[PDB]
C-alpha cells in the first residue's frame, strides 16, 4: 500500500497478512461467488498493484479461474496501450508515461507506481485501474463456476416463496445483463416461475407489486 | 524490520510474532507448496535479513528442505562475492562494502544492514537480495516434495474437466520451464490428456480456443 511522510513525500508499505489470508478464505469458502469481487476491493482499497499481485499469487487453487483473470488483464492493457501510446523520447530521466505492463506492476516497481499516483501533474490511479480490470476477470470466473439460469430456477409446492426469490435475486446479481431486462425479470419472471396457483396469489396485488407487498402477501400461503 | 526517526535517521525493530507464526503455518499446512514462496515475501516485505533468518530458524520440521535452501544461499553469495569483490583498504572506519555473508546477516548485524539500505550513496537493498536467493531454494523444495508431471496428469471418464485443468495449471506454475513451452502446453497437452472423445468436444472450438471458451463448452459434457 502507500503512506505519507513529513515534507509531503509518500512511501510504500507491505500488505497486511490478515488481508491476504481473508482474500484467500473469501475465494475458498465462497468458491469464487459474486461476493468475492467486492471483498477483494475493500481488502485492497488504498493499496498498489504489486500488493494486488501477491494476494492473487497466494491463492494456490482455483488456478484455472486465475488464467481467465490473466486473459482479461492482457486485453484491457492492450486497449490502454492503444488509447495511451508511447509518447516518444522523454526529457532527462523523468519517469516513463505508464503503459499496460506498468499498471499491473510487471515492467515496473511500487516506488514508480506511487510516484505516478502523486505525480505533481497527471496524478494517475495506477492502483484503481488494475483492480477494475481484475474485477472483470473475477466476474467472468464467478459465472463459469455457477452457470445456473434465472429462468432455470423454479419454486416447489412444499418449498417457500422468500427463498425462491432469494435464489432469483442472487442469480440476477451475478449476471451482467442490462438493468431494464433485470427490472422486467424482477416484475414478471418471478411471478411466472412459481407454483401452479402461487402465481395467482402474487397477482392478487393490483399490478407491478413491490417486493414488500409480494413477500408479505404469500407468507404461509 | 526498519522504521524511521526525526532528523532522517532509521532504526531496527522486531519481526511480528503473528508474521512468524503465519510463515510456519503456511509451511506446515501447504507442506512447502508453491503458495509458500510468495506468502514468505508478503510476510517479509519491509523487513531485514536478520528477521528472515529467525522465521526460517523457527520452522522445526521440513528441515531437509531448509538444507536445500542453504545450499542455494551459499552459491548465490559466491556469485556476488566474485561479481562484487573485496575493494581493499577502506578509509577510516567506514562500514565495509557488503559481501556474501553480510547480505544474509551472518558476518554482520541489523544496524549495518539498515545503514547500507540508506547509505547516502549506493543505498543497497540487502533485505530484498537475501529473499530472492531464498525464494530460489524454496522453489527447488516445492518441486522435490511434489514432483508430479504436467504430462502425467490425465482426465477420468466420470471425472470433470474444470478440475483436470485446475490440476494442470497448478502443476505448470510450480515448474520453472520457459513461457513459450508453457503456452504450447496450455494450448495442446490439455486437449490431448482428456477422455477418448472429450478431446474432440474441446476441439469443436475452431482453433487456439481461449480457456473461457473451453471451460464453458465442456460443462456437463
Amino acid at each position: 500500500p502507500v503512506q505519507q511522510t513529513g515534507g509531503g513525500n509518500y512511501i510504500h508499505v507491505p500488505l497486511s497478512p490478515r488481508t491476504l489470508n481473508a482474500w484467500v478464505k473469501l475465494v475458498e469458502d465462497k468458491k469464487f461467488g459474486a461476493e468475492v469481487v467486492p471483498g477483494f476491493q475493500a481488502l485492497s482499497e488504498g493499496c498498489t498493484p504489486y500488493d494486488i499481485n501477491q494476494m492473487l499469487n497466494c491463492v494456490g487453487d482455483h488456478q484455472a479461474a486465475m488464467q481467465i483473470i490473466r486473459e482479461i488483464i492482457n486485453d484491457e492493457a492492450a486497449d490502454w496501450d492503444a488509447q495511451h501510446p508511447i509518447p516518444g523520447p522523454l526529457p532527462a530521466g523523468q519517469l516513463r508515461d505508464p503503459r499496460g505492463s506498468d499498471i499491473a506492476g510487471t515492467t515496473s516497481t511500487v516506488e514508480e507506481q506511487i510516484q505516478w499516483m502523486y505525480r505533481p501533474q497527471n496524478p494517475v490511479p495506477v492502483g484503481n485501474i488494475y483492480r477494475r480490470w481484475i474485477q472483470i476477470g473475477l466476474q467472468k470466473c464467478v459465472r463459469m463456476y455457477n452457470p445456473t439460469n434465472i429462468l432455470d430456477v423454479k419454486q416447489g409446492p412444499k418449498e417457500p416463496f422468500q427463498s425462491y426469490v432469494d435464489r432469483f435475486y442472487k442469480s440476477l446479481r451475478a449476471e451482467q445483463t442490462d438493468p431494464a431486462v433485470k427490472n422486467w425479470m424482477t416484475q414478471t419472471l418471478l411471478i411466472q416461475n412459481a407454483n401452479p396457483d402461487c402465481k395467482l396469489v402474487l397477482k392478487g396485488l393490483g399490478m407491478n407489486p413491490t417486493l414488500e407487498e409480494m413477500l408479505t402477501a404469500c407468507q404461509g400461503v | 524490520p526498519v522504521q524511521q526517526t526525526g532528523g532522517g535517521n532509521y532504526i531496527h525493530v522486531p519481526l511480528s510474532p503473528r508474521t512468524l507464526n503465519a510463515w510456519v503455518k503456511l509451511v506446515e499446512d501447504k507442506k512447502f507448496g508453491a503458495e509458500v514462496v510468495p506468502g514468505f515475501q508478503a510476510l517479509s516485505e519491509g523487513c531485514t535479513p536478520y528477521d528472515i533468518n529467525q522465521m526460517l530458524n523457527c520452522v522445526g520440521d521440513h528441515q531437509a528442505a531448509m538444507q536445500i535452501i542453504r545450499e542455494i544461499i551459499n552459491d548465490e553469495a559466491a556469485d556476488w562475492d566474485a561479481q562484487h569483490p573485496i575493494p581493499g583498504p577502506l578509509p577510516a572506519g567506514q562500514l565495509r562494502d557488503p559481501r556474501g555473508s553480510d547480505i544474509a546477516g551472518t558476518t554482520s548485524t541489523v544496524e549495518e544492514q539498515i545503514q547500507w539500505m540508506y547509505r547516502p550513496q549506493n543505498p543497497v537493498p540487502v533485505g530484498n537480495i537475501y529473499r530472492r536467493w531464498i525464494q530460489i531454494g524454496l522453489q527447488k523444495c516445492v518441486r522435490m516434495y511434489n514432483p508430479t508431471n504436467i504430462l502425467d496428469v490425465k482426465q477420468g471418464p466420470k471425472e470433470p474437466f474444470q478440475s483436470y485443468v485446475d490440476r494442470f495449471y497448478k502443476s505448470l506454475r510450480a515448474e520453472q520451464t520457459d513461457p513459450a513451452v508453457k503456452n504450447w502446453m496450455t494450448q495442446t497437452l490439455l486437449i490431448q490428456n482428456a477422455n477418448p472423445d472429450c478431446k474432440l468436444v474441446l476441439k469443436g472450438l475452431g482453433m487456439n480456443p481461449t480457456l473461457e471458451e473451453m471451460l464453458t463448452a465442456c460443462q456437463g459434457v
Binding site: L56 | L172, P179
Partner: peptide, 12 residues
C-alpha cells in the same frame, strides 16, 4: 501479452 499463460502475476 502482459502476463503469459502460467506466469506468476507481477514482476518478471
Amino acid at each position: 501479452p502482459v502476463l503469459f499463460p502460467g506466469q506468476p502475476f507481477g514482476q518478471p
